[PDB]
Amino acid sequence: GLSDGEWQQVLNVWGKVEADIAGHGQEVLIRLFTGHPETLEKFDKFKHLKTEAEMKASEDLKKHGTVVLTALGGILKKKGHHEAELKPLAQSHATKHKIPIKYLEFISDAIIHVLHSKHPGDFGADAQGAMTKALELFRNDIAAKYKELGFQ
Ligand code: HEM
């Protein structure tokens, strides 16, 4: 798990996201979709986005980014005591959306990249370490539920 000092860094970094949740969310999803086009195919409602310009112009993509980052923020503020929050997300993403755990790795990496891109020089080495550990814990607990369901 994370130390209290590490959790404090996670939630300090998260204050940057909360100042512009929609912009961070849109950029996270765009980074995921352009870097890994197969992920776009999992969204019926985003398959029509042929270009990054269409993605950036999509108000509904920005809306979903707010949904995604609001959910992640709620989980992070539990500092690892997130079973109730995480279990339904793991179950919807395995059983309904059919999201391989690899794609959650992709989006975790996308979050780290967006943080550096929007806050260059202001996302320190300790902050990246702590946020990475928090995202790894999130992914690992999802993975446990994936394994329970036998989902690949
Ligand atoms: C930080 C990681 C993620 C979080 C917090 C997150 C959160 C959410 C939430 C809260 C919803 C709506 C409620 C639900 O269906 O459970 C949702 C829907 C969805 N998620 Fe995720 N998600 C994440 C990653 C991903 C990834 C990586 C993919 C695919 C590559 C994905 C695919 C989908 C799809 C297809 C839907 C339904 C979209 C629709 O409404 O048409 N999710 N997600």
Side-chain angles (χ1 to χ4, degrees):
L2 280 76
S3 69
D4 271 86
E6 287 170 336
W7 279 122
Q8 183 175 43
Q9 290 267 16
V10 174
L11 298 186
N12 189 255
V13 169
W14 197 253
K16 302 175 141 67
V17 174
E18 304 195 314
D20 179 17
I21 181 150
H24 283 76
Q26 163 195 89
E27 289 194 30
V28 167
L29 290 180
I30 283 172
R31 175 68 176 190
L32 176 75
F33 290 160
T34 62
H36 309 276
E38 71 269 33
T39 59
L40 188 75
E41 295 313 301
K42 297 291 181 165
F43 291 89
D44 281 336
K45 72 183 190 210
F46 299 140
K47 270 193 275 79
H48 71 275
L49 292 176
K50 282 176 172 276
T51 68
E52 175 167 351
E54 281 156 350
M55 297 181 191
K56 194 86 177 165
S58 176
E59 294 304 328
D60 190 59
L61 188 148
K62 184 161 264 217
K63 188 183 179 172
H64 194 63
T66 298
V67 167
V68 167
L69 291 192
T70 300
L72 181 56
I75 287 165
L76 293 177
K77 293 167 171 180
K78 289 304 249 184
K79 298 165 68 181
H81 304 273
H82 53 219
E83 165 71 23
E85 289 83 9
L86 192 141
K87 190 191 161 172
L89 268 197
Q91 302 213 131
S92 71
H93 282 58
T95 70
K96 175 164 210 29
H97 311 317
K98 290 171 71 155
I99 306 311
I101 193 81
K102 187 70 164 186
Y103 295 3
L104 301 187
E105 180 194 353
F106 294 159
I107 205 174
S108 296
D109 285 347
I111 291 169
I112 296 298
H113 167 90
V114 169
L115 287 170
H116 279 299
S117 181
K118 289 179 86 49
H119 312 278
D122 198 39
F123 183 33
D126 51 355
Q128 180 177 338
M131 181 62 61
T132 298
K133 276 190 168 161
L135 291 171
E136 284 172 336
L137 180 65
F138 169 75
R139 195 148 79 249
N140 199 60
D141 285 350
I142 288 183
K145 306 291 191 157
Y146 273 26
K147 192 190 167 187
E148 177 190 345
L149 303 164
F151 173 70
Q152 292 281 354

